[PDB]
């Protein structure tokens, strides 16, 4: 008469690595990096806007793509490939850190600055820009001399914010196809727009020359950007070759800003974003995206790493 | 491995047992039989479950685009900000490694040590009225039923009651 | 844990013994008393003395600003360096607290180590002349007086002198 | 008869975090994250510059604010919030650069450039920059034509670096607040300033324009700045609306360069520097400041992580 | 230390042995002579083997230059990628330095475990018909020669043999 | 009788650092960080460049000491202390993107852009770039107006990337030591260089003026580039002080590139580069150099890791 004693053991183990030995057999193991994409953006409960067509920088501008995003607001900004900032073709001074400041910036709030103006015109348009017809960029204003070659009187605005957060202000400068046509649009001579705002000054000139086709235009308006403080003054000093600010914006709050390519899907709940998809795991680990953004498990190189749950598997 | 026992003294484990991880096999009067240690099973598996809640656990720091998939940033920036998250990468790898790892060795160990915790608190029930067999059973060297192995199994067995019939059992 | 003393065979411990933390509870002729093993004190002390100093230790590594908390750096490098602040606080928070329950988890079981440590360390002295209890004590079947107890707590005690004794005092 | 042992215990013990439980008694624990503060610049034992009032890049402009500091040394340079670089409306062109360049200087010692000149003033004043009424940046000069709207003659300067050290080289760039007024400071015409030393060539154009007041002024003047290295010149050609250097910056040694609004005090000895105050601690990591500067315990999240110094603690 | 053995109750080791890291010396009969365990050996070597492989290991991670040690970048980048590459310097001298001690503190022990393995491997075969000195031998408690030694470290010793002969020579 | 257990030791142990304890005694150790350096370039069975004189951005505009580098091919690219991207003096605009794009390219495939010219010369040498006496960068053309003084007519050529992979388009902007002698080359008045793709907006204005001499010359070229993407155009838009871009140039493949002091070595295979030779080691870190690139141990601080391979050594 005798008694034992013993620890089960199973058929099929699974094999795991250790600091002394590679592939040893244990009980039950669990898998600690996530492979498994789902390809949609798990958007559910989450004030989202899609932009589309519409480009994050257009939000400010107003293209026509962007008409109902001039003053969205949101916890979640997705970007797309087919987006587009600008209907006469140009880009952005310093673009990428005026799309940091939006894709976070849970919306944008419009306010005028409400600029009048004596001695010039303030309408032009262009066929790159439709709408009803010939358009151009809703909140900015092509500020053209009064009639062809006619002088452009070199002004002077101002705007100060009112408000209690700090303001996005935007210019253009246009760069035409020629110097004659720099001279029909806003009369001859060296033409200088400054512009400077107490913590920040700097100052533009036009470069008239001919440059390649793009939405059958061969002119480009360049624009650029400044934060105005709260109790603060920007004056724009030009005369002439100068889209003017219609309206200053406003940061809402707080987001999250993402670009991707798959649908969006309220069904889902996720928090790990990537331009494929949402990565929804308890893991601590990844390998799917490096640069997943949100809240993510460490992206790893391994695409598999096993985590003993059991005792050493040994059969007969 | 480490405490001599799973892979040492008890050669190969008993494929029979569903109940549990540790368990006792008889072979006495009424025959063989089986039954699992629930409590040596239970600290076994709740020191499992403590890993496993402090490992598939949520960071709640948020990152965000420092980078652009569509427009490509400037390349010296570009190439300093791929050069960082390539660093940052070999380092998640090396430390998820190297954890997992660490936490099997552990794991393996831990299961190792809980069961000569269970050889060496029964060879204490049965102080000297049985002797190691060597292999992981022990020789009683005196009669014991099917209600005695059970006095075993859940801790009450006294060994003075049978000390007598053992010590000369053994000679 | 890992050991089966401390939290195992030897349920709970005394709140009386305030020398050491490991020590020896009799009770023979003249009563009961407590005194406290400085070696294997010692041995627990000094080890988790070493943790310590490895530990409680500075860098010599300079950092300066790259940043600026009064006029704000542009926004794009100002946030690729938050980027990067943010993944390194990342690495050393999880550093941190890994290396504390890695650590934690040694010094409770080395503790625990040094105790069986203690145990089978007089069983060793008193040879056949004593057997388990099964909690942590000694059964002496012979007699024992308080110069015949710190015969034991000094690893002096031969067993040949009682082990005429004590082989009948167990029959 | 009979021998027992055991291990110690107690009534109190403290829970501490192992790789397997949450909360496990123990006899003894120490605190590994720092918490705790020091409200001042411990600065015992080192050379200590507090600039107060003077702004870092005022040091080298020398606006009055910065008189008493234009040659410092120093092991500890101190940034304070009502600093300010400037007493002329203005700034420095990319300027964090610089600041990171003078605070590891340990010190700056200025050498002239003893440029002379024929055929203009040397000697514009200003509201703005008052020392005995009217005056100007300390290390630098008005340049202005003879006589208002007179020619400024087409000049240029040049200065060799004799030392073994490299220098910090300074001029500045005036933007009147009208065409006109540029006229009647540096004469009519476009106005051109360029500046090269061999391994560095650039060359700037001034931007007259109306930006609102600061200090009672509506111009601008922007610096700008270079490392000339050991043997090499660097030369000045100008025609006006120029700011001129009449003393070269040579760094001293090494440095630590720390912000902060708290004050110093030579009692306490310490390494680590944040703008709050001083952490001082033999602990490897710490919950205070994650910008943290000097030699510092590393920032972590966690506010606390208590480390086992004892046994289980296993009461009745 | 932690598992009692090595610079524990076996104080001091064989520069004498020099065929394998654990061993036999025994003393009968015919006299005293050594004689190395190769399995116990061999499960020793093969685990720090694992280890070496484990570390001796290259990354395939390249990276490339963003910096510039002729024509030295711009300032401000030039500082944010020294201050990147400092912080990273310290994650791997921290990786480092605890890669190695913890390392070393399982390497130790189980060396350490693996002898006592070896200790409890005999003392199980050797039954009834021996007791433990209290230093790491066997007091044999009846004749043992060449051949009797050879049958304890070839694992085939039966004990019935001799427990006849043991048992009246302990009393 | 009895039989005795025991284990080896030795009269000389190695000391390791353990999670406990300083300096403990174990029979054999392995060292883990790597010290030895090996003062050659590791070479062997890769396609190397050595550029020697040549600069690597030489590679693009063809002064005479890259003349045997216009058409490189590799797998590693080294660069030398000695090397120099120009013959009349200047610099590249954003030059360290190039190098960067240029170290990593596997070389280079020159295609020609094949502009013609109306009205002008084409051919300016100078002495700072000797090959048969007078000459200049080999990829460029020295564009000057007919005869001195003469006009300049303002002039637009186009270049389209044909081809499937994009094109590395350069130009160069002149800038005359004086205002008299930039009339002599490309005749009077504004001078305004504008250029752009389609993806890309810029313009440049040269800027005359006094700089000390460099190879003889007081004058200075500065290099623009820009990226060409497959089936997208860049137009050139000029009237003078233009350096114009005689061929486009491609992309091969992947290469690795360093810059070092010591020999190329066809004898030893490498991967992990520095300036000072190549790190050949197993050992998973290395104390040689912190900016060491290719597959590389990591740098440590540390100088030595002890890491046992062998138990405690007990001797008597
Ligand atoms: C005598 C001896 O064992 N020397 C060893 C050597 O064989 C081994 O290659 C090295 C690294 O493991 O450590 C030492
Ligand atoms: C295997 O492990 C995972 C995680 O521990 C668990 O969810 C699963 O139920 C386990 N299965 C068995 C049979 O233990
Ligand atoms: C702004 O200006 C008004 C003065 O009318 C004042 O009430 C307010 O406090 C100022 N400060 C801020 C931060 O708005
Ligand atoms: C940086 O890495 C991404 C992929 O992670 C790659 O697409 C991109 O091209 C890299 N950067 C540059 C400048 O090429
Ligand atoms: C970076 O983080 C700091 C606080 O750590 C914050 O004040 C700052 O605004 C952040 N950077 C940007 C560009 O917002
Ligand atoms: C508790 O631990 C700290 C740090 O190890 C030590 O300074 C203190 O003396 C300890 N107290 C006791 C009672 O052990
Ligand atoms: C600098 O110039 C002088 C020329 O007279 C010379 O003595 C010195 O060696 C030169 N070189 C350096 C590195 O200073
Ligand atoms: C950055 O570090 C490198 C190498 O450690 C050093 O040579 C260089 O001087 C440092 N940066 C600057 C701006 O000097
Ligand atoms: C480029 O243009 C040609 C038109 O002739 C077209 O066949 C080709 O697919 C286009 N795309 C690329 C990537 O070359």
């Not at chain 1, 061969?218 to 219609?246: C, E, K, M, Q, Y």
């Not at chain 1, 390998?287 to 809240?295: L, T, Y």
């Not at chain 1, 992206?299 to 096993?306: E, F, G, M």
């Not at chain 2, 039989?33 to 499992?48: C, E, H, L, M, V």
């Amino acid at each position: 008469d005798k008694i034992c004693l013993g620890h089960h053991a199973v058929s099929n183990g699974t094999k795991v690595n250790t600091l002394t030995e590679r592939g040893v057999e244990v009980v039950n193991a669990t898998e600690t990096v996530e492979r498994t994409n789902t390809p949609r953006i798990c958007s559910k409960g989450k004030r989202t806007v899609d932009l589309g067509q519409c480009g994050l920088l257009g939000t400010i501008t107003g293209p026509p793509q962007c008409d109902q995003f001039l003053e969205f607001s949101a916890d979640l900004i997705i970007e797309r490939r087919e987006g587009s900032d600008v209907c006469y073709p140009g880009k952005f001074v310093n673009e990428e850190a005026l799309r940091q400041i939006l894709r976070e910036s849970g919306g944008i709030d419009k306010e005028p600055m409400g600029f009048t103006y004596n001695g010039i015109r303030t309408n032009g348009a262009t066929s790159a820009c439709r709408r009803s017809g010939s358009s151009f960029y809703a909140e900015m204003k092509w500020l053209l001399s009064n009639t062809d070659n006619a002088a452009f009187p070199q002004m002077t605005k101002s705007y100060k914010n009112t408000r209690e957060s700090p303001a996005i202000i935007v210019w253009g400068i246009h760069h035409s196809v020629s110097t004659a046509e720099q001279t029909k649009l806003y009369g001859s001579g060296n033409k200088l727009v400054t512009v400077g705002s107490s913590n920040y000054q700097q100052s533009f000139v036009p470069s008239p020359g001919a440059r390649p086709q793009v939405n059958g235009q061969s002119g480009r308006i360049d624009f650029h950007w400044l934060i105005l403080n709260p109790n603060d003054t920007v004056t724009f000093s030009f005369n002439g070759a100068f889209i003017a600010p219609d309206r200053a914006s406003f940061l809402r709050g707080k987001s999250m800003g993402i670009q991707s390519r798959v649908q969006v899907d309220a069904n889902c709940e996720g928090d790990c974003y990537h331009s494929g998809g949402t990565i929804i795991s308890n893991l601590p680990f990844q390998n799917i995206d490096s640069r997943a953004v949100g809240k993510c498990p460490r992206y790893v190189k391994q695409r598999s790493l096993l985590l003993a749950t059991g005792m050493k598997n040994v059969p007969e | 491995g480490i405490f001599g026992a799973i892979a040492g003294f008890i050669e190969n484990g008993w494929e029979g047992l569903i109940d549990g991880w540790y368990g006792f096999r008889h072979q006495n009067a009424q025959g063989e039989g089986t039954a699992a240690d629930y409590k040596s099973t239970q600290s076994a598996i709740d020191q499992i479950t403590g890993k496993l809640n402090r490992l598939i656990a949520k960071t709640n720091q948020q990152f965000k685009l420092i980078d652009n998939e569509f427009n490509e940033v400037e390349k010296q920036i570009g190439n300093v900000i791929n050069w960082t998250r390539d660093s940052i990468t070999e380092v998640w790898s090396y430390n998820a490694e190297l954890l997992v790892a660490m936490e099997n060795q552990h794991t393996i160990d831990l299961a190792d040590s809980e069961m000569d915790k269970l050889y060496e608190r029964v060879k204490r029930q049965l102080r000297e009225n049985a002797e190691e067999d060597g292999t992981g059973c022990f020789e009683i060297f005196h009669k014991c039923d099917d209600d005695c192995m059970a006095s075993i199994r859940n801790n009450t067995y006294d060994h003075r009651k049978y000390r007598e019939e053992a010590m000369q059992n053994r000679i």
